[PDB]
Amino acid sequence: FSACTHSFGGTRDHDVVEEFIGNIETYKDVEGISDENALKGISLLFYGMASTWWQGVRKEATTWKEAIALIREHFSPTKPAYQIYMEFFQNKQDDHDPIDTFVIQKRALLAQLPSGRHDEETELDLLFGLLNIKYRKHISRHSVHTFKDLLEQGRIIEHN
Amino acid sequence: FSACTHSFGGTRDHDVVEEFIGNIETYKDVEGISDENALKGISLLFYGMASTWWQGVRKEATTWKEAIALIREHFSPTKPAYQIYMEFFQNKQDDHDPIDTFVIQKRALLAQLPSGRHDEETELDLLFGLLNIKYRKHISRHSVHTFKDLLEQGRIIEHNN
């Protein structure tokens, strides 16, 4: 990283970050720079607020892998996973909200979580306890295997 | 299952269920019974309440494995996962409850979940939002990789803030 053209000013756009990190991942094995010596001179590739950031976070930067992970973590703005779970369990299904809109609001938060963390069974387990008592008296967790099954059966209780 | 000695009357005991399911799984392909020919004649292995039960649940038993799953689900009762998640997220960390005891009770609930479902990263994600604001001002999720890290740092804020 002695004369790398690539730079990053701290713009919080996902693809800006992915191209810069892709660009520096280039350089590290352009000239044969170490893991230690890549994390050595990473500051030289930052300017503006990317350096205000790195100067504040160079202490979790134990590894080159964690430093790259930190760049994606801060500069690709996401609702953090822990904030997603809290918001997931904060609003139960009231007596007036239909089943379709309730599942939409819950699947919206679940889609922000890492793909492949929870399967559809686990996601139903996270959801089922918040389902209103109006629907749970007629449908049982072991009877539903997919969100489609939950919606399909839940739409029938809404007809009568 | 034309002349199987093994039977099950519907007693809701974990160990009764495990021996019955183990015995029929044994029998099923010592004699080479299909998965679909086992689900055909599974009714012959039930008596009493277990047959009144099977007639109520053999609609949801599309496959042989789902029939076994129904037996464990119904006659080996466990605390449902959805009830565990619900009560896990029901009480935040109050201002005077220390982090150590709060984390213990919360991780106790996570231990009730199926073994191997969540790794420590996900379990930290489930917990972190419940931590009191006076710890979260000083600790950031990206700083914690293990409950060990969270507890160690959390003990420092209660020593002197």
Q: Taking an 8 Å Cβ-Cβ cutoff, which residues of chain B contact chain A?
A: 60, 69-70, 73, 80-83, 85-86, 89, 117, 122, 124-130, 141-143
B57 Cα to chain A: minimum distance (Å): 9
Q: In Å, what resolution does this model reach?
A: 2.3
Sign, Cα dihedral of A56, A59, A62, A66:
negative
**DSSP output for chain B:** --S----B-----HHHHHHHHHHHHHHHTTTT--HHHHHHGGGGGB-THHHHHHHHHTTT--SHHHHHHHHHHHHS----HHHHHHHHTS-PPPSSS-HHHHHHHHHHHHHTSPTTSS-HHHHHHHHHTTS-HHHHTT--GGG-SSHHHHHHHHHHHHH--
Contact yes or no for B124 and A82 at CB 8 A: yes
Length, in residues, of chain A? 160
Experimental method: X-ray
Are A60 and A39 in contact by the 8 Å Cβ rule? The answer is no
What is chain A's alpha carbon radius of gyration, rounded to the nearest angstrom?
23
Interface A-B, measured as beta-carbon pairs within 8 A, has a size of 52
Neighbouring C-beta atoms of residue B109, cutoff 10 Å = 19
Question: How distant is the Cα of A12 from the closest Cα of chain B, in angstroms?
Answer: 17
Nearest to B142 among A73, A83, A85 (CB): A73
Which residues are CB-neighbours of B114 under 8 A, at least 6 positions away?
B81
Contact B141 A80 (CB under 8 A): yes
Give Cβ neighbours of residue A34 (< 8 Å, ≥ 6 apart): A40
Interacting residues of B144 by C-beta distance below 8 A, sequence separation 6+: B124, B128, B150, B153
Chain B contact set for A60 (CB, 8 A): 142-143
Q: Are B124 and A80 inside 8 Å of each other by CB?
A: no
Contact B117 A122 (CB under 8 A): yes
